[PDB]
Amino acid sequence: RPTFYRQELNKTIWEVPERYQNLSPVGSGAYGSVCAAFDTKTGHRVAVKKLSRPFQSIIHAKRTYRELRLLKHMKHENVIGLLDVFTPARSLEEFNDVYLVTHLMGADLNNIVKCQKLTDDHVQFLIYQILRGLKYIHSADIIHRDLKPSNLAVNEDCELKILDFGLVATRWYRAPEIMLNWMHYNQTVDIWSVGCIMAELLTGRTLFPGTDHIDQLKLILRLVGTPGAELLKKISSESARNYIQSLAQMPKMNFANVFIGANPLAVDLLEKMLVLDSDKRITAAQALAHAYFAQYHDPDDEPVADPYDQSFESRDLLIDEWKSLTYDEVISFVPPPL
């Protein structure tokens, strides 16, 4: 058990092993309570996240457990990974704080798109990496559900990782089938988000900047057109079905006339991602084989994930139970090799 030291960073206490030096807060809140730090074991910059009030309620406790289970699972070049997880607590009794250590990324894609206009080469490589990360996440029956430019981070080498900073509107990147509340949705909600992201990388503009869930739905249908009988037949919600069918019909736009001057291959992939019918939307694994990625695509180098035990998601437990389970996960953690 290493030696810890204490300090106070922007109205927050931090008790970290001495191996982590020069803690410097980052993102002024956008990422949570996160410090850049120098890791003396590796000689690399890292990010250290202190969980806020991790065991305040059953719901915080379950969220804390979930985040640690997800981070301990992710072992892929295009998904954030756990370098370390620690607590200053010597016992389960004293256990009240959780610190997660990850790679420090250079910039989020929101800052990249807002600051820079991207080339087709850079779009190919960034979307290839998102899809490669998604293939991996999806193979474990994990759905991100929150994909947006601020949840993607890039290094100066253009190496991309998928993250989720939690709480640029999520709304703008969200699949129409999980816009009005209901349970008919698959992993391809994430492929819709990737389409919205790729559009914004290609054009410099939010594709669908809805002011609310109704506006958002109107902006989507204006590009992809109102559903035919085929898709209408699969909408269980009378109230959603009444809303959609209450709209004046709208044709599917020719995407080549919307994304004028884009690589036609980019336009073809976008057509395959921004399909209203989530049963007909391209999967991550399918998208990686698209002729848009010919330069990057290597079927022997697009790994899937080990299975992930999500069975806790259905469980209703007490704070102290979720806390004990989280403590177990802290103790059993095996760092990745240096």
Ligand SMILES: Nc1c(C(=O)NCc2ccc(C(=O)N[C@@H](CCC3CCCCC3)C(=O)NCc3ccncc3)cc2)cnn1-c1ccccc1
């Ligand atoms: N700010 C940072 C860091 C940093 O902050 N690292 C710590 C960290 C800890 C956890 C997570 C995280 O993603 N936790 C994910 C789980 C893993 C996911 C699972 C799905 C697939 C993706 C991975 C998570 O549960 N969130 C909490 C949450 C999500 C949704 N609703 C509510 C709460 C991300 C980062 C590193 N680099 N940078 C950086 C620096 C400069 C510019 C841009 C970025």
